[PDB]
Amino acid sequence: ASATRLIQGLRNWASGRDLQAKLQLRYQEISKRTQPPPKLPVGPSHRLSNNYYCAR
């Protein structure tokens, strides 16, 4: 990005792979930080009245 069309065409002509499309300089889809806080679910225990440690 931040380039004109002439050198863009020179890039896509020196390697005909459409380098403008994906270029490994991310601008947009950096993951937006300060995410919401998670609430972690608990799996096959905290199930009351049946979690017998003699069993498992």
């Binding site: 005909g16 792979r17 919401p36 806080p37 998670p38 609430k39 972690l40 679910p41």
Partner: protein
């Protein structure tokens, strides 16, 4: 509620093809271009050589008539 990170709605396809476009043309065309440009250069070089031969004979005339 649960706030893990699953794939939200599924992710699209990811390519893995050996995609090589094979830029260029056939080799017979390459030989044709090479021999054509080479022979073009040969004809132009021939013409310039014999023009300078004409001028070199004129310089010989200069040194002949200049001598006594």
């Amino acid at each position: 509620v649960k706030q893990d990170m699953p794939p939200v709605g599924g992710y699209g396809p990811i390519d893995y093809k050996r995609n090589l476009p094979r830029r260029g043309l056939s080799g017979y065309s390459m030989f044709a271009v090479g021999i054509g440009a080479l022979l073009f250069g040969y004809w132009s070089m021939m013409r310039w050589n014999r023009e300078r031969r004409r001028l070199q004979i004129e310089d010989f005339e200069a040194r002949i008539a200049l001598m006594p």
